[PDB]
Symmetry: C4
C-alpha cells in the first residue's frame, strides 16, 4: 500500500499529467480574462477550475503520505503546498485579492519542471552574498527617507508626507524615473538647494549598485 501509492506519484505519467493540467489551467486563466468568453463559455471554466484544483489537492495529499516529514523540508514542496493552500479559500469572503492570489499556482510549472527549478535555484544562490549590501542600503534609505519627510513633506506631502511616502519617492528616484522634471525641479522651486540632497543621494545609490554588480561577477 505504502509502496503502491509511492510508485504512482513518482511515475512519469503522474507528473506529465499534472504538468499537463497546469499548462491547461494556465490557458483557461488567460481565457477567463475575456468577458466575452466568460459570458458565452465561462460556467464551463468555473467548474474546470474546481476540477483542476482538486486533482492538484490530491497530488499534495499523496506526496505528503509518501515523503512524510521530508515533504516539508522541501522548499519547493512547501511552496506547492502554500500555493495550493491560498487556492483553497473560497471565491467569496476574506478579500477579492485571494481570488487573484490563486493565479500564483502557475508558479508550480516552475516547481515541477527541473529546468525551471535549476534556473530559479541558481538565481537564489546569488542572494546570500548580497544580504550585506542590502541591509546597509535599507538603512541608507531609512535615514534619508526620514530627512526627506521633515524637509519636503509639508509642501510636498504626496511625495514626502510620510516615511512610507518618502520611501516610495526615493525608490522612484533610485530607479531614476522621471526624477528631474518630475520631482526635483518642482522641489527646487520652493527649496532651491534641494539638489544638494538628491544629486548626492543618486551618486551613492548608483555607486552601490555598480559595486554590487562587480562583486556578483567576482563571487
Amino acid at each position: 500500500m505504502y509502496l503502491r501509492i509511492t510508485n504512482i506519484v513518482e511515475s512519469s505519467f503522474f507528473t506529465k499529467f499534472i504538468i499537463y493540467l497546469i499548462v491547461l489551467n494556465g490557458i483557461t486563466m488567460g481565457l477567463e480574462t475575456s468577458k466575452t468568453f466568460m459570458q458565452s463559455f465561462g460556467v464551463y471554466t468555473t467548474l474546470f477550475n474546481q476540477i483542476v484544483i482538486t486533482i492538484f489537492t490530491i497530488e499534495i495529499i499523496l506526496r505528503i503520505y509518501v515523503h512524510r516529514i521530508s515533504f516539508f523540508k522541501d522548499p519547493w514542496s512547501l511552496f506547492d503546498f502554500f500555493v495550493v493552500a491560498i487556492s483553497l479559500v473560497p471565491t467569496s469572503s476574506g478579500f477579492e485579492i485571494l481570488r487573484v492570489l490563486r493565479v500564483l499556482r502557475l508558479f508550480r510549472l516552475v516547481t515541477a519542471v527541473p529546468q525551471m527549478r535549476k534556473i530559479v535555484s541558481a538565481l537564489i544562490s546569488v542572494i546570500p552574498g548580497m544580504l550585506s549590501v542590502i541591509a546597509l542600503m535599507t538603512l541608507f534609505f531609512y535615514i534619508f527617507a526620514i530627512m526627506a519627510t521633515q524637509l519636503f513633506g509639508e509642501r510636498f506631502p504626496e511625495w514626502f508626507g510620510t516615511l512610507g511616502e518618502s520611501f516610495y519617492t526615493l525608490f522612484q528616484v533610485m530607479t531614476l524615473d522621471d526624477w528631474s522634471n518630475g520631482i526635483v525641479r518642482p522641489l527646487m522651486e520652493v527649496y532651491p538647494y534641494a539638489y544638494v540632497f538628491f544629486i548626492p543621494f543618486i551618486f551613492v545609490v548608483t555607486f552601490v549598485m555598480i559595486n554590487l554588480v562587480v562583486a556578483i561577477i567576482v563571487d
Copy 2:
C-alpha cells in the same frame, strides 16, 4: 551548364557586384523617403529597385544550383531567400504593410560581408543558453498580466484592460519608462496598494536581468 554557372557565382566579381549594389540600393532607399525627391525622380528609382531585385532573384537561383540542398542548410542563404522573396510581393494595393518590409533587403549587407556575419553569429550564440530564462520570464510575465487585468483593468482600461494590454504596460515598467508618475501613482489614487504589485515586480525583473547578463558573461 553546371560548371560555367558555378564558376560565375563563386567569382570575386559576382559577390563584389552584389555587395556594391546593396550599398547603392541602400543610398537609394534613403532617397525614397523624401517625397520632394519622389516627385522629381521617383520613376527612376522605383525601377532601379526593380532591376536590383531581378539580379537578386537570379543570383539566388544560381546559388541554389551551385549548392543544391546545401543552400537550404545555410542560415545566411536561407535568410537571403526569405529576405528577397518578400521584396517580390506586389506593391499592389490589397496589402501595403509588405511594401515596407522590402527595406529589410538591406540586411543582405550582413549576409554578404564576413566581418558582420561573425558578429551576428556571435550574438545569436548567447541565445540558446538563455532560452530557459526567457521561458521563466514569460511565465512570470504571463501570471502578472493576468493579475493586472483582473486587478486594474476595470478602472484603468487603457493600461490593463486586456491581457495583451497588461503585458504591454508591464514591459514598459521593466524598462523603467515613466513607470511611477506615469502608471502607479495614478493606480495608487484608486488602489493605494498597487506598490505591493509593482515594487516587487521591479526587484524581480531587475534581478533576473542582471543575473542573465552575468550568466551571459560567465557563459
Copy 3:
C-alpha cells in the same frame, strides 16, 4: 589601575550599549515623523533623544581619553565626533537645517558594526582608482556646461541660463532622464541643430561610464 576607564570602553558591553542606543534612537526618530505621535508622546520622546545625546557625548569623551591623537586619525571616529557635535548646536537663532542634520547620527550604526564598516570601506576603495576618470568627466561637463550656457541660456534660462543651471540640466540628460521630449525637442524648436550637441554628448558620457565599469572589473 591607572587608566581605569580604558578597560570599560574597550569592553563588549560598551559597544553593545551604544548600538542598542542608536537602534533605539533610530527607532525613535522614525516615530517622530508621525505627527500624531508628536502630540500623544512628543514630550516623552524629547527626553529620550536628549539622554542619548548626552550618553553619546560622554561616550565620545571616554574614547578620546583612551585613543588620544589616534582617535583623530580614525575616519570613523572623526565622523563620530562631528556627527555628535552637529546634533548639539542650539535650535535657537541658528539655521533650522541643523535640526534635520542630527539624523546623520543614525549613520553611527554603520560606524559601530564592522560588517557595515567593511562595506563602507570596500565601497570607498573603488573611488581612488576612479578619481582620474571623475576628473576627465568633470572636466568634460565643465566645458560643455560653458557651451550650453552660451548657446541656449538666452531663450532657455530655466535650464541653461546659469552655469550651475547648465550643470544640473546636463547632469539630467546624462542620467538620460526625460531628455528628448523633456529637453532637446523644446530646444530644437528654436535651434534646429541642437541634436549635434546633445546627441554626441550622450554617446560620450555613456561610453565612458560603460568602459569605466568594464575597466574596474577586468583589472
Copy 4:
C-alpha cells in the same frame, strides 16, 4: 636658429607653462559665462583671451620647427593645431557658433597631461574593437528609420515625417526615454500594431548593447 630653439620647447618648464595657460583660460572662460562679471570685467579678459591664443599660436609654430614631419603625425598635436585654429577665426563672420567653439581649447588639458592622455588613449582603444558593431548598429537604425517614415510619418511628421526625425526618435527609443507613454502609445491611438515594431526594436538594441559590453570585459 632651429636646433637652438628645439632645446627650449622640450623642457619641463615649458609644458607646465602652457598647462598653466590652459587652466587660467579655463577658469576665465567659466567667468565669461556670467553676465555680471562680463559687464564690469569684460575687457581685461577679452584681452587676456587674445594673448593666450597668440602664445598658443606661437607655441604651435615653435613645436612644428622642433618636430617637423612628426608634428602632423601626432594625434594630440593635430587636436592642438585645430582647436587653436578655431580661436584664430576672427571675432565675427556671422557664425558665432565658433565664438562658442573657442572653449573647445580647454580640452588641450587632456592632450597636455599624460594621465588624461592615458585615459583617452585607453578609451579610444575600445573603439576599433567595436567598429564592426557600430557599423552593424548604424545599419540597423538606418533600416528601421526608413520603415518608420513610411509607416508613421504622414500622421506624425514631427516624430517620423523624415529620416532624421525617425533617426532621432529611434535614437530616443534606444535610450528608453519616454518611449511608451510618450511615443509608442500615442502611435497606437492611430496604429494599433505599433508594438510589433518597437518592442522587437527595443529587445534587439539592448541585446546588442548588453552583449557588446560583455565582449569587452572578457577580452
